[PDB]
Design a binder for this molecule. Structure first.
Ligand SMILES: O=C(O)C1=C(C(=O)Nc2cc(Br)ccc2-c2nc(C3CC3)no2)CCC1
Ligand SMILES: [Br-]
Length: 134
């Protein structure tokens, strides 16, 4: 068992706030924003040894990352950015930092009651996306 266990499972998006504005700040173009904003992803989180896998499945894109905490990796995001990512666990929160083109965005995942809350921040702009167990 690991503390990381509270995240494992299959999660469905139930609410989103400010995601269009977050996407604008990240640089996502109009058409991608509209279709991505409409997505209702399921997030599947699993752990095998030291390797964590996060899959996001939707009608728009299916994406998957695997990683070890603290160990940088190259990632292609859903909006086709090529970023350098590092994911760590900080006080019970999964903190995902993406770096590209001299920019940075941070995505925090945390358990709050029966929800998995995803907070995405790009400069001044925060989007909050709430998932519940499928
Ligand atoms: O809730 C989540 O896990 C999060 C995201 C999410 O669900 N993103 C998408 C999901 C689908 Br489906 C399709 C497209 C996107 C998409 N994101 C973006 C830019 C903002 C990053 N551009 O497109 C992104 C931040 C955390
Ligand atoms: Br998705």
């Amino acid at each position: 068992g690991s503390h990381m266990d509270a995240f494992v499972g299959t999660w469905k998006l139930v609410s989103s706030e400010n995601f269009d504005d977050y996407m604008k700040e990240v640089g996502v173009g109009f058409a991608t924003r509209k279709v991505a904003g409409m997505a209702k992803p399921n997030m599947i989180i699993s752990v095998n040894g030291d390797v964590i896998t996060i899959k996001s499945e939707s009608t728009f894109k299916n994406t998957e990352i695997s990683f070890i905490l603290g160990q940088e990796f190259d990632e292609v995001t859903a909006d086709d950015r090529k970023v350098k990512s590092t994911i760590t666990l900080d006080g019970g929160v999964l903190v995902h930092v993406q770096k590209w083109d001299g920019k940075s965005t941070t995505i925090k995942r945390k358990r709050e009651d029966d929800k998995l809350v995803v907070e995405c921040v790009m400069k001044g702009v925060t989007s909050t996306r709430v998932y519940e167990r499928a």
